[PDB]
Amino acid sequence: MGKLSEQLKHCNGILKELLSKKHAAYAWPFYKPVDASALGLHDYHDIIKHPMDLSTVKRKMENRDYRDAQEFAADVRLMFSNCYKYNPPDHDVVAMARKLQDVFEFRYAKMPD
């Protein structure tokens, strides 16, 4: 019932939206951990020290791992940051990251106080 639980419900709402059909055209690369081997990205885990994806964020939310909205936001932004760090800015995945991050940031900003 407290503020932290309430803010985490808003976070859970955002997470459900990021995983929803509405955003699937650009969200799908972020659904599961990057399979570096399958994608031929044999330097991925040398460059990205802390992989993150929405299935991992969902597991952590379901497990009550996140103690506050800030911790949840840090993982969602880590996921985007990894994309911007690894990929050349002209790869389609970077455009898709930017579009999904726009959805995230605008709704995260509507956090209940």
Ligand SMILES: CNC(=O)c1cc(C(=O)N[C@H]2C[C@@H]2C)cc([C@@H](O)c2ccccc2)n1
């Ligand atoms: C989070 N996902 C990724 O960072 C990623 C990277 C690459 C990739 O090959 N990156 C090489 C350009 C770099 C050296 C490919 C994919 C793949 O899921 C994908 C294909 C086509 C449109 C969108 C996504 N995802």
